[PDB]
Amino acid sequence: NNYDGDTVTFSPTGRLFQVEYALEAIKQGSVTVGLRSNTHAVLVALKRNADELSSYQKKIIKCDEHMGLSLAGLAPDARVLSNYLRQQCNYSSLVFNRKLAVERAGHLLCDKAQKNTQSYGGRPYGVGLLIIGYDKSGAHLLEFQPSGNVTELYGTAIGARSQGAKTYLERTLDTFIKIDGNPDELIKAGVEAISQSLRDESLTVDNLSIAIVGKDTPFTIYDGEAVAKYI
Amino acid sequence: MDIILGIRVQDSVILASSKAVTRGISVLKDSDDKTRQLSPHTLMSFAGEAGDTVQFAEYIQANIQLYSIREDYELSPQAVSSFVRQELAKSIRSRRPYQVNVLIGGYDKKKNKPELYQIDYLGTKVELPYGAHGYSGFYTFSLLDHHYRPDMTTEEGLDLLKLCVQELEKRMPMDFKGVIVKIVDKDGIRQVDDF
Amino acid sequence: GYDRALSIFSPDGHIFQVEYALEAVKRGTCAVGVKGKNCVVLGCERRSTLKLQDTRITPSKVSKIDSHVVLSFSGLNADSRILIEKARVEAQSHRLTLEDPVTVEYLTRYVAGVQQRYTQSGGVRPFGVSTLIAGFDPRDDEPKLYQTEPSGIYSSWSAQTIGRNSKTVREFLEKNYDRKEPPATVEECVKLTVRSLLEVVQTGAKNIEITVVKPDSDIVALSSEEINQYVTQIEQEKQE
Amino acid sequence: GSRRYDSRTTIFSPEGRLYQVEYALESISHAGTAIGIMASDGIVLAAERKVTSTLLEQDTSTEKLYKLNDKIAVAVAGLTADAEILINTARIHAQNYLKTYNEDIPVEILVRRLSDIKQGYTQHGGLRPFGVSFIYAGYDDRYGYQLYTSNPSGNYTGWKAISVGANTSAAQTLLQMDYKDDMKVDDAIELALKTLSKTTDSSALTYDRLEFATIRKGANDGEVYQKIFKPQEIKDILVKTGIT
Amino acid sequence: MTDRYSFSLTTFSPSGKLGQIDYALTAVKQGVTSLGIKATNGVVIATEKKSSSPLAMSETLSKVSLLTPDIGAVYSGMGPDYRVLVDKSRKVAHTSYKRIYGEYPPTKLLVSEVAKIMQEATQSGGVRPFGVSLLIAGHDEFNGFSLYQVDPSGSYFPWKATAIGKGSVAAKTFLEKRWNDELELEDAIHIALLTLKESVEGEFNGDTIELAIIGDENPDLLGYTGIPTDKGPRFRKLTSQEINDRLEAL
Amino acid sequence: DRGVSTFSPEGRLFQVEYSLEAIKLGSTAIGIATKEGVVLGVEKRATSPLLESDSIEKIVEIDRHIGCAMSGLTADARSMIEHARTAAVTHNLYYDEDINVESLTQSVCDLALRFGELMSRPFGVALLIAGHDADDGYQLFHAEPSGTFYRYNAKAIGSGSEGAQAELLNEWHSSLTLKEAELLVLKILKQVMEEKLDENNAQLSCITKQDGFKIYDNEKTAELIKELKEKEAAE
Amino acid sequence: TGYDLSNSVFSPDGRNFQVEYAVKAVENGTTSIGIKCNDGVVFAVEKLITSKLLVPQKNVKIQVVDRHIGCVYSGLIPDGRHLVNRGREEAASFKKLYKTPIPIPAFADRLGQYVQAHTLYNSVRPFGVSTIFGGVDKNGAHLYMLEPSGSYWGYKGAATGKGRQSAKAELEKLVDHHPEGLSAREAVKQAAKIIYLAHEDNKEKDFELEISWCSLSETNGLHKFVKGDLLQEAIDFAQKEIN
Amino acid sequence: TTTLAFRFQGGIIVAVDSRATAGNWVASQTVKKVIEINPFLLGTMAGGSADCQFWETWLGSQCRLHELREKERISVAAASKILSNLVYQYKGAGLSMGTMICGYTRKEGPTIYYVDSDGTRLKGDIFCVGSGQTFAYGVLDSNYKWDLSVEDALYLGKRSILAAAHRDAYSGGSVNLYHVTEDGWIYHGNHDVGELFWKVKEEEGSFNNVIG
Ligand SMILES: *[C@@](C)(CO)[C@](*)(O)[C@H](Cc1ccccc1)NC(=O)[C@H](Cc1ccc(OC)cc1)NC(=O)[C@H](C)NC(=O)CN1CCOCC1
Known part of the structure; x- marks a missing residue:
């Protein structure tokens, strides 16, 4: 109310409203789902268009051969953060000849987002990210919120009506976690998960976006006729 | 570069400047004009390091022209010469100094007098009846000491200048491919085409 | 450094600081530009609440940017000097690198860019000035007349006016200027310019300045008597 | 952050006026009147000191009239402290010009640059403008004797006779009435003092509440002399014109 | 972080007033009375030593400060602001004058430099004006003795005699009756003590009054001998005992 | 006042949203993408x-x-x-x-959000970026001051945009010729424009692989305007 | 008023409301504790299991500084991480120049001055975390608790978060019943109990226990996480005491 | 290197060799020393290969940006001055460049500008640049007339490079010919000195110093 003019101001109950408003931009964003087994991690993203003449806003971005994310909210902010990740993954490779751990990737995003919430002039990032990766400790899935809070999960979902997919994954937990050595089945579980967040619209060929990374699979994105298999 | 001369007579300033542009063992050009008009009644000849010469001349030219447009007024030859000297005086203590020597011939319209200034790359300014830069001076100064009179006409000044060019063409080691002569007087700047 | 974003969008999609800068232009003394078949004429109002002026030394309303281009303006006088200075420096800088004087379009484009930069730079307010830039391109006899404004937009005009009561004189020019047949001579062009100012000015004494620009750096400012003859001639034809 | 406390000194009103410039002019309108009058053979500068106290040291005092170089002087109206900042800049600018061109600076060039500085404080930097109006009185070999005035907006204009500070409206009407072009310096001296005497908010105009200066070619042959009047000299010139 | 206050905190109000300068002058009005009187052969500056507590040692707090050997300063208003001004004033005398000309600045020019510093606090970004009015008394070879007043605006005026602070209005009226252009230094000290007694309420002695003079050169206070041209400081602070001696013949 | 980079309670940047209102006041610009080329008209x-x-x-x-x-x-x-x-x-x-x-458009859009307390405010202009490359062929992009860009088959921006966009929705198909697209831009511009459309107050342009980007002459556009009027009268 | 709208502004009381508002964000957070023992310190924290989808043991909240200091915090988790990152920079530069690892009191002031610095300007926000930290140095064991204002003290026991009062009461009993001292292995078990007892103030979601410890004898003076058998032993001890 | 370009009745002829050297090591025989800036501008390269190659393709980018910004092809004068002002900024640093900016525009007509790394910029009708410039001059000057036909001018340019290619140890490989007209530049082929020498010797009867 009087305490939402900038990020540097606390409310009387100890809230940062600008951070909460940035969080609100994610809720308006199109749904995206993340889930993993022990061998693979999968992103599934519902893309959004301006109208029938427009393209469908790309939701999934590659960070390295073994890592990448999906976005929900302000796309330019996701570009800034993804680019930062690309550099950090790359720094780790050039300097240490070491693939960046997915956990460290999360720690780095947390610290970058945090600095924007404690200083005058700046603003919080207006996007939520789901980072998947495969590193030396197996498959991973992270959830990034622009408050700074990063969380490692078996599965999750962010965006509008993400609660439907998030409930489904909470039920399916014991099933999909043991889909080891089978990419197509783990994707099917993710495509079924995102379907719980659909209203009036259904998954079409230029609407659905799927990404996968795993033990013997580089981070690769599937669009267009390549996702027709899963509809 | 190499030969630049200047003679101030009764009613005008006459600047002679060699036409040769040599590099290594090749005369690349024999029709080079080593001069810039700073203002309608002010002319600057120049000689020195390659590149530096023209770069400096055109930089001064731009500044004087900028002043003319701003004030709708022509700077006196004295004022221009002082500006140029200061630019060179700064330059000499720079990371890379301009290695350019200049002569500034001008007609002061307020005084109705011709004026010739000699300024070297260090920023050493002197007003003179006749001036030269480089090895030319070693021949022309003593020659002009003898033949120069302060009340000469422009025609007499040109004959006096022909005497210098002849002496240089006789005793100078290098072929400087003749000179471009220009006259600065009450009516402005004009070039003698047949020299 | 002072960083404040002074020029910002409002809910309705307006940058008020830019729009308030236009109000300063509307307050300024009237200026008019009319281009003929072989010339451009810049006319300027001078308010007569100032007697005991010294017109020899008082800054003239029309300024030479180079020997072939001129610039008149309406709005804040102090602001206009900054634009004129920058334009004059760019004029010499263009001659230095391109070895050719600026085109009237290029010079206008530069001045307009400067004005625009002050609408989205921190710590600065927009220029409270609109300009009329006239002249002839190098080795060209086609007349050029351009206008700029605080926002940064610029465009070419057959004839245009800016400043206070400019809407009245623009009304006059819109019916009195034929695109098919522009003022064929210098006299015709000056007369149409003086006529248009006489709709707004008051007296045709020391209130009107006229500057005529012709091809190949041929710029001259008319004196009082020369202008007064146009004023005398127009009024006698009017009584009909 | 600090945005909360920013006055925004360099913005436009809805009417297209610069608030701070307008308010600075309002400030200046309460300052002691200063008058400049340009004659054919010289210039007069006259200024009224702000309500004087009897214990003020009058002879070793400078409030209104300042010397910029040997050829140019200024009369001040507004904040003295602000004026001195600008005067030292103007003094330096003159010496820079002399150092560069070996010629004394033309009056208009000096005036323009000082006015350009004032302009800057109204367009950028977020600082308050200088609450000062100047009357420049000077000579150069191009235009001869020149009067200019500048104000906080950074706008300057040339004059035959002009007043700044308090009661300019009344003062300008009186100058416009009695001024003529063929006027001499000694006539202009009388006009300046008569004008102040009628526009003054004081009971009676006396020597101790005035600063006075002339710029004549009254030296010996084709050269200019600045005369900043001493207390006793102002006392004499006030008697000579019959004001006291 | 960083000073984000790059804008003026002192701005013109619609009526033309500079609010902060006016308010700073209000702070000076609240301040304890100080005064200065110029004689023919010297200057005297004086003020009351308002003690904050009787346990406080008022000798450790010096309201009258030496700026150069021939220039002294006293104030009315906010003590801390005065203290830092004295520090800056002492330094500027060296940096902008003595290190250039090899001699101490004349009074009017040092005053001018102090005024400049106070003016900048009136216009610079993110600062309030100084809440003091200074009285600077000094001597120099070509101007002789002089006394100046410096206000929060940065304006300065030369005075024959004046007072600033609490009871300045009454004190100035008192000085107008007593001051003439033939006053000797001892006569000015006498008048200074008389004028100050009016504004002081409690104890009136050498321990509650601070008083200094700009008078003759003091070779005994120089600290060394051998250079004839160096003759010692004209500034001298009167001792607690020296004040009481003059209070008996009051 | 308030920060330039401030979020609203709905999760949008005030300044970016206000700049979008400025773009609605602007003059109409239409772009149509075909397999024979992309047409741009304003x-x-x-x-x-x-x-x-x-x-x-x-x-x-x-x-x-x-x-x-x-x-x-x-x-x-x-x-x-x-x-x-x-x-x-x-x-x-x-x-x-x-x-x-796409890379070009992305580079332009990187400037967009480089404002705050960098430039002082967002851009108050939207761009239609049309082009061709060997990989993705003929493309039309809508670049906003939000930093976001969408690819479009056809798109209208400016004051008559929502009315023109609804018209483009009906008219566009994947087998439009260049000539058909040219007429379609002229047709839709004439509908949403205030003053009557002619060669002097409307301008056409196109980008083709063979000839590259070309702005049309007033003579060439005038004939397309005449061809358009005749075809509408013909049924 | 309006004294609470800007950081570093004194209210007429002499208070910085913005700091007190940051304290509210700390009170909202999960419970964390610190127990000083014979030859070291023990840290423990409550991790609310928001969902079944959270991977157990893989959202670590206790952080190590250098090799001998442990830090835990309640409130805005990112703010806590920022503070630890600074702490690590401070500890690195100390070791760089002086060779010896940073002493705990020295380290405590480094964080203290940094947090205090964020109450000096309106261009920065106060930290939304109270930090419990400590370790073993040349002078033995030290436990500290740092608050948004920059205020810190040494502690026998410390607690912050939503269940701080419950935890404090339980801590005070240990100090009274063990005047000679508490052993490191005991303090680990007690820490588990106290987090379980303090969980009553946050009992909607069930939680995950996380413990760490520094001890001169047990961990050789270095910070280590309590895992496996020792953790399960501590969990069982806590489970027995609530019933 | 040997590069030349001369102005004549029928426009401009430009001719260059194609050798690259690292000391006495012949690094290449097939180097392109002419860079086609646009359909009306040419640049010749002599001196450091990287310096020439890098900065002249950079010059081409600046000329493209000019015609985008000004809706008009850059003048030969302006193009040459961009390059000269650039190298002047690097004066002393150790750049090695001898270039000739050749082209046609309406306002200028056929124009040639000599630009080098110490900041010299010269307009002229004839220039030869490179280690073998003197050898090219010898043949070019003694056969040059303004009234040469397009056919004769093309040959003289070719023959002058051949002359230098023969004598100068650091010139050779092949001759690249160009002809600049009001309609733009026209490429007149690559001519290997391996065959061209013997063909010229036989047909012309020249090169009698060599064992036939
Ligand atoms: C003839 C062959 C005489 O060398 C020409 O000048 C020729 C011109 C040319 C132009 C474009 C492409 C190829 C060739 N120049 C060279 O072939 C050139 C000769 C040269 C070498 C070194 C120089 O030092 C400043 C100047 C001129 N050869 C090279 O540049 C060779 C291929 N590269 C190097 O020597 C690498 N050096 C360059 C200088 O910096 C250190 C590394």
């Missing part, structure tokens, strides 16, 4: 009849294979175009090739 909208309409430059070349049309505060577009041109030429210098239309 409403010139001269404020006065004395203004020489051919000096109104709202369609602009970025490179030989990329063109651009604008709408809104068109003065703001100058530095965007300058950047785009430099980006395009610089990439050709570094890689000895034409730059992808």
